[PDB]
């Protein structure tokens, strides 16, 4: 059975910098697609950004030059990172990993981060 | 026999099939290039792999029981026989170290493409490289343990006659034996300028 | 007679080769419960590989006395 | 091709017969046999070849050349079925065949010796060893050959071979059994030569076939002369005894049937070359062995063919015919005629 | 003084004897107890039947042949021989002492043949009462038969052979023709033929029939297949009456055969106590003659010209006894001996004691060597065992095969004296190799970081892992340092471990094997100097080490190179190594990536350098003989050592990839058998648990010792020799020499000698 979970979540302080971490295990193939998505309180998700197997980067608008997403050295870890919060960035946070054709798709627990 | 039967049959059945198609135009149809150009090319390489030390490994063992049982049939009344024939059985060996050793060499060729370009130019070429070049070493190893077997046992049966015989027959194994090398060669060749999966 | 010496060996190496590993895992030593399929709990496992120790004891002593007799 | 597929079964086999090969005695070591003036010296000279220690057992004063002939001849029979011990399939079909040939000698001496009121304890230690069977000393119960066919030979692997026998008088006799024998012999080797061309692979079929050839003729040629020694035969029925499969049929043996004298018999074997010179000179049997020899010989130099082991066969036997020849010689010490042995090695 | 012919060979002299017929019998019974000289035939040329002392060979042979007919008297019985007694003339130790006078010969003759007379006509009395024994005894089985037997004259029967039986019964079907009433009975105890000493399962018969003309033919037939006939009458009083005579010659013949039976066995248990002294005597008189018929004979002097190999180191002794010899026996003589010298070819002799012994065997199974060229046995003593090990890498085996060993050297003493089963000596002949090869397999499998298939943490790894992971996260290591000895135990359990161990082993093999070949080959060159032959040395020795060096030396200076740099930090792509040499010669001149400076001029230069030692090697030896038609096997010769000179350089550096295969293969076993039955047993609780636990361990130690020991370790052991007898001795090793082989005296068996 595949897992995955998240890290990094917490409260800061009004434009300050703050990385998210995670993982996923139980699976021995690198998943094709990674990707981050939000949820404030009283809305639906919101995609953030995603990362190809081959290092291609894909960002939402809103963050677009102050978050910044990456793979890390083995395999299936990922990275999120953002340079400045603000009060609209807080919301819970969550992984996602996926498969090129079928129903394998994969989606973590979640973290939340308050400025 | 039933079996000869089966052949004709088959036969006949593919040429009424490929005269429909061709009648009825639909000639087109059986389009053997977009088969040989779709099929994943995993398939040729790791077939070829398989092959090539399965073959070689049928030829040396071949030769073995060829030369061996002739060896022990001969040595009952001249167990002298025994300690210096091995050679024959050397020879016949080695067949399939060179078939582990092209193992070794094809089998850094087997990274994994992305899918973007797994039917591209480069890639298709290792594979049908590996495949051919794979025959060719697992057939002519597997042709070379046969001839130097036959020779290891009419060695073995001379030898036991008088012991000056040996070193005349012994020339012929060389030459059988260069077969080997030969196979070897041009395996190396014809898959030396094939790239690594991309 | 030969018909003790086997299972007096078999029974020696029992001992000493049962106990070490008891030991190992007593002490959660890394080649033994490091990894995620290991067993979760060193001491629980210790302790029945450590019985198992004790039964071959017993075989060593009652097949050497009938060999030394 | 050839070897690929021999050794799965007979690998062994050719070795260890190519073994016995080596042991055949050469020109060299007849010669030193020729130089012995007793066989208790024989016996002595014998023991370095081959043949080792196989008289070990023999008092000096029980020496005689029925003796050595008979421990030199047990010699071969141990080694012939010890080979087809090992053997399975169509190579252990191949060495009964060979084997059918003497029990059908045994059966006609058996009731030669029966129909002269013979003890049958006397018979049966001249009886070949090789051609043994079961039931072999019951054809000493009657002389009816209808009575002894239903009692007896319906049981053995002989019984094809009486398709043409039965049309006898009630009552056999030394002549009318010797028309059953070679009327056996005729069925014989044409079913050997049948078998061999169905079963056997190259090389070893044309080997044979020319082989089981040679002593087709042979059979042939030693008919025609002793039918000679008869008032009469009706050519019609010698015709039958003469079998199908030889270099000399069907042209030379037509003539050689209708033939009438020694004048004759020449005139028609004047036509075939392989044996263009054999009746002006020397003695006419010794020219038969000579030539079977140059046969064995030749087969030899093939590999990885089963009619090695006839070859054998028939070369080990030539030489206790030499061996017992000088034997002979040393005993009755006539010994100008000494240097008559046969051997190419 | 002794020199140590263990190096080379011990040196050879040649002497010839001149002793007097008078003293010759007592003189070469003192050579026989020497066992130090090998004599050679002088007169090879004259008929065995020629030979001068054929008739007092024939003498002593008759009497072997009885004193073999004696002995299977014996074992025809019960009776057994009294044994021992083996070291009453020599401990072996070649001590002097005096043989048996010719009266006592003569006796033994005249008492063997005396003892045949009698067994003979004893024997054969003996048996003739037994076929009457026999013969009443399955009569009265018949008449014992019960009625109902003879309910349904008005029959025929008797005894037959139980195989036979099937037969009689369709032959007298078929001549019946279908009118047959048959009834058969069998009988519980084999019974024995004395024409065959080989026992039957008989069977009784009988039929019915009233017309006199059938039942002469029945009789007929069952005589036929050696049935025995009996006479019976109908009614039951004459059956009564005649049960009753049987009986009493019966109960009479049983006096006949205990009085003469008891009479023979007492004769056999006298020559019994003798006979094998007898034959150890007789024995010893045949060969002292054989040597002697070897000799020349002298008409024109009483005197005898023999001629024998001694080793010139022991030559002192031969001549101090055989003046004890004229001390004993006062004849006066002259000189006996003279040393001579000859263009002969003398034998090989090499000293071994309890520790050498197992691995010379191990050479002279191969070939005797050639006279003082250099003896493979010492390089074998390390190189075997090692080459062994290498492969058969791991502590755990190796410490219970060393443990077999120390069981079986500590011992020795008393295991020498016991008989010995065929497989175990073979074991106990190896004692020492065993052991050697057991406790160079713990030093190896340390540097392989395994026992049993599990690592060893002593020193601390070179290898740090990350901080902080979460359970289940992959994770990789950076490096620290290097490990002091052997293998880094961070490798273990590592999923991409086996990329990095076969990277090890396989450039472990092809050094080793490098090494081995070029060790063994300066050997050659040791010959060479010592033979003063210097065409040799610029015809063979200095063109095969250029081209054997400016190969496979070059490629094994390239992997032992590129370890000592530091690619990564360097910034350069590390070359790959099956390219380069491919390139070397498939395409010269030409580099993918660079090794070294230069790299491309000197890659080039060595091909040329490799190329033109070939006619070098080919043209320069024959050359130099048609300076001075026989000088076309010279030519001949040379060119089949060229051809194959070149092609087995490549094949025997490519077969010792084998030491990296058998090590691979050793190891995953190992894996799997712990994984598959120690593993499981982790998993159970409580008193289940532990009879799971007591129950697998057997499972595990069984397997382990049954394959992964005797089986691996022979596959393994075997596999040592073949790099011995092929790869490596083949560069520097002769062979075809002449084994040293002393006439002596021995114990015979006297179950050999009649087998």
């Known amino acids: 059975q595949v897992q995955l979970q998240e890290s990094g979540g917490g409260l800061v302080e009004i434009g300050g910098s703050l990385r998210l971490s995670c993982a996923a295990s139980?699976?021995?193939?690198?998943?094709?697609?990674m990707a981050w998505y939000r949820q404030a309180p009283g809305k639906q998700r919101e995609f953030i950004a995603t990362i190809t197997s081959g290092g291609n980067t894909n960002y939402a608008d809103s963050v677009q030059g102050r978050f910044t997403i990456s793979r890390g050295n083995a395999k299936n870890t990922l990275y999120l990172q953002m340079n400045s919060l603000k009060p609209e960035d807080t919301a819970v946070y969550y992984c996602?990993?996926?498969?090129?054709?079928?129903?394998?798709?994969?989606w973590g627990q979640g973290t939340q981060v308050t400025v | 026999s039933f079996s000869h039967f089966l052949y004709y049959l088959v036969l006949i059945v593919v040429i009424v099939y490929g005269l429909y198609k061709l009648f009825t135009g639909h000639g087109s149809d059986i389009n053997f290039g977009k088969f040989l150009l779709r099929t994943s090319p995993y398939m040729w390489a790791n077939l070829g792999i398989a092959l090539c030390v399965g073959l070689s490994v049928v030829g040396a063992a071949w030769g073995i029981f060829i030369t061996g049982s002739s060896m022990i049939g001969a040595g009952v009344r001249a167990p002298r026989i025994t300690t210096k024939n091995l050679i024959s059985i050397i020879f016949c060996e080695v067949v399939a170290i060179y078939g582990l050793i092209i193992a070794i060499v094809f089998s850094s060729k087997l990274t994994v493409a992305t899918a973007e370009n797994m039917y591209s130019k480069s890639n298709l070429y290792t594979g049908y490289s590996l495949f051919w070049a794979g025959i060719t070493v697992g057939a002519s190893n597997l042709i070379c343990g046969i001839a130097v077997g036959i020779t290891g046992a009419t060695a073995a049966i001379s030898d036991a006659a008088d012991s000056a015989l040996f070193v005349k027959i012994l020339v012929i194994e060389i030459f059988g034996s260069i077969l080997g090398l030969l196979g070897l060669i041009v395996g190396l060749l014809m898959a030396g300028k094939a790239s690594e999966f991309q | 007679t030969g018909k003790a010496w086997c299972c007096t060996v078999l029974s020696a190496f029992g001992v000493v080769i049962l106990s070490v590993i008891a030991h190992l895992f007593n002490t959660n030593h890394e080649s033994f419960v490091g990894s995620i399929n290991d067993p979760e709990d060193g001491p629980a496992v210790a302790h029945t590989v450590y019985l198992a120790a004790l039964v071959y004891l017993v075989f060593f002593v009652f097949c050497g006395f009938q060999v030394y007799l | 091709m050839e070897g690929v597929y021999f050794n799965i079964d007979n690998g062994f086999i050719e070795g260890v017969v190519r073994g016995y090969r080596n042991g055949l005695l050469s020109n060299n070591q007849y010669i030193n046999l020729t130089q012995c003036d007793t066989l208790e010296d024989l016996k002595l000279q014998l023991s370095s070849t081959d043949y080792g220690n196989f008289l070990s057992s023999v008092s000096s004063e029980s020496l005689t050349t029925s003796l050595i002939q008979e421990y030199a001849s047990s010699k071969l029979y141990h080694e012939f079925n010890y080979i087809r011990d090992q053997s399975s399939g169509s190579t252990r079909k191949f060495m009964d065949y060979i084997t059918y040939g003497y029990m059908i000698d045994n059966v006609a001496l058996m009731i030669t010796g029966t129909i002269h009121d013979r003890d049958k304890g006397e018979i049966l230690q001249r009886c070949h060893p090789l051609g043994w069977f079961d039931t072999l000393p019951t054809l000493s119960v009657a002389t009816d050959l209808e009575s002894l066919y239903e009692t007896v030979l319906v049981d053995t692997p002989l019984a094809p071979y009486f398709k043409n026998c039965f049309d006898t008088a009630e009552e056999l006799d030394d002549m009318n059994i010797e028309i059953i024998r070679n009327k056996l012999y005729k069925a014989y080797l044409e079913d050997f030569y049948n078998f061999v061309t169905e079963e056997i692979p190259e090389p070893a079929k044309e080997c044979m076939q020319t082989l089981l050839g040679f002593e087709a003729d042979r059979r042939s040629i030693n008919i025609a002369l002793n039918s000679l020694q008869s008032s009469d035969i009706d050519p019609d029925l010698k015709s039958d005894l003469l079998p199908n499969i030889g270099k000399l049929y069907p042209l030379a043996t037509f003539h050689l049937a209708q033939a009438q004298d020694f004048e004759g018999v020449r005139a028609a074997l004047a036509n075939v070359y392989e044996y263009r010179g054999f009746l002006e000179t020397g003695n006419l049997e010794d020219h038969f062995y000579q030539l079977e020899m140059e046969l064995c010989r030749d087969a030899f130099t093939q590999q990885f063919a089963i009619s090695t082991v006839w070859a054998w066969m028939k070369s080990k036997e030539q030489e206790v015919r030499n061996i017992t020849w000088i034997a002979e010689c040393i005993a009755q010490n006539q010994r100008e005629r000494i240097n008559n042995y046969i051997s190419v090695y | 003084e002794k020199e140590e012919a263990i190096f080379r060979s011990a040196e050879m002299a040649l002497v010839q004897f001149y002793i007097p017929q008078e003293i010759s019998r007592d003189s070469a019974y003192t050579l026989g107890q020497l066992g130090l000289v090998q004599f050679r035939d002088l007169n090879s040329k004259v008929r065995a039947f020629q030979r001068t002392f054929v008739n007092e060979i024939r003498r002593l042979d008759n009497v072997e042949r009885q004193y073999r007919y004696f002995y299977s008297l014996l074992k025809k019985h019960d009776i057994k021989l009294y044994e021992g007694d083996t070291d009453k003339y020599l401990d072996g130790s070649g001590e002097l002492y005096v043989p048996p006078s010719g009266s006592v010969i003569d006796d033994y003759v005249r008492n063997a043949s005396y003892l045949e007379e009698r067994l003979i006509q004893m024997e054969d009395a003996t048996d003739q009462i037994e076929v009457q024994k026999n013969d009443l005894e399955q009569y009265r089985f018949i008449l014992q038969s019960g009625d109902e037997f003879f309910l349904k004259v008005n029959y025929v029967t008797g005894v037959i052979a139980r195989d036979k039986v099937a037969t009689l019964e369709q032959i007298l079907w078929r001549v019946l023709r279908g009118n047959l009433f048959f009834k058969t009975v069998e009988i519980e105890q084999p019974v024995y033929d004395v024409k065959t000493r080989e026992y039957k399962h008989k069977n009784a018969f009988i039929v019915f029939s009233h017309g006199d003309l059938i039942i002469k033919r029945i009789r007929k037939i069952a005589e036929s297949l050696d049935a025995n006939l009996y006479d019976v009458d109908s009614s039951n009083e004459g059956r009564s009456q005649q049960l009753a005579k049987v009986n009493k010659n019966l109960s009479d013949l049983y006096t006949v055969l205990k009085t003469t039976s008891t009479t023979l066995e007492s004769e056999l248990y006298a020559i019994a106590k003798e006979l094998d002294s007898w034959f150890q005597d007789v024995t010893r008189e045949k060969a002292i003659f054989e040597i002697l018929n070897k000799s020349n004979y002298d008409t024109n002097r009483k005197i005898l010209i023999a001629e024998g190999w001694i080793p010139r180191d022991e030559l002192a002794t031969l001549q101090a006894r055989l003046g004890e010899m004229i001390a004993r026996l006062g004849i006066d003589v002259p000189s006996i001996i003279q040393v001579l010298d000859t263009n002969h070819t003398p034998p090989t002799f090499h000293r071994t004691n309890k520790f050498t012994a197992g691995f010379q065997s191990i050479c002279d199974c191969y070939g005797i060597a050639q006279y003082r060229e250099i003896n493979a046995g010492l390089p074998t003593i390390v190189t075997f065992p090692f080459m062994f090990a290498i492969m058969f890498g791991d502590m755990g085996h190796g410490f219970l095969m060393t443990l077999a060993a120390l069981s079986l050297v500590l011992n020795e003493k008393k295991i020498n004296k016991m008989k010995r089963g065929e497989i175990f000596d073979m074991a106990f002949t190896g004692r020492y190799i065993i052991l050697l090869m057991g406790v160079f397999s713990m030093y190896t499998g340390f540097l392989y970081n395994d026992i049993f298939s599990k690592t060893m943490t002593i020193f601390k790894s070179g290898w740090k892992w990350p901080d902080h992971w979460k359970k289940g996260e992959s994770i990789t290591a950076t490096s620290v340092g290097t490990y002091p000895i052997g293998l880094d135990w961070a490798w273990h359990g590592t999923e991409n471990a086996l990329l990095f161990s076969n990277s090890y082993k396989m450039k472990l093999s092809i050094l080793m094997g490098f090494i081995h070949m070029t060790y063994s080959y300066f050997f050659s060159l040791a010959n060479h100097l010592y033979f003063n032959s210097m065409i040799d040395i610029i015809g063979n020795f200095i063109p095969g080490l250029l081209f054997m060096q400016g190969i496979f030396g070059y490629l094994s200076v390239c992997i032992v190179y590129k370890w000592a740099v530091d690619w990564v930090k360097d910034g350069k792509p590390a070359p790959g190594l099956l390219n380069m040499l491919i390139n070397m010669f498939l395409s010269p001149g030409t580099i993918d990536d660079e090794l070294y400076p230069h790299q491309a001029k000197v890659q080039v230069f060595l091909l040329l350098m490799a190329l033109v030692c070939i006619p070098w090697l080919l043209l320069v030896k024959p050359l130099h003989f048609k300076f001075t038609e026989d000088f076309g096997d010279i030519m001949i010769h040379q060119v089949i050592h060229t051809i194959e000179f070149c092609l087995n350089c490549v094949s025997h550096t490519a077969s010792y990839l084998r030491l990296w295969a058998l090590s691979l293969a050793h190891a995953q076993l190992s894996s799997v058998l712990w994984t598959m039955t120690i593993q499981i047993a982790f998993g159970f609780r409580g008193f289940v648990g532990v009879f799971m636990t007591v129950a697998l361990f057997a499972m595990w130690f069984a397997l382990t010792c049954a394959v992964l020991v005797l089986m691996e370790g022979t596959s393994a052991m075997l596999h040592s020799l073949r790099l011995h007898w092929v790869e490596s001795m083949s560069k520097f090793f002769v062979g075809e020499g002449l084994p040293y082989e002393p006439f002596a005296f021995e114990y015979k068996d006297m179950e050999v000698a009649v087998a």
């Open positions: 996602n990993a996926r498969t090129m054709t079928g129903p394998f798709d994969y």
């Open positions: 139980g699976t021995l193939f690198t998943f094709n697609t």
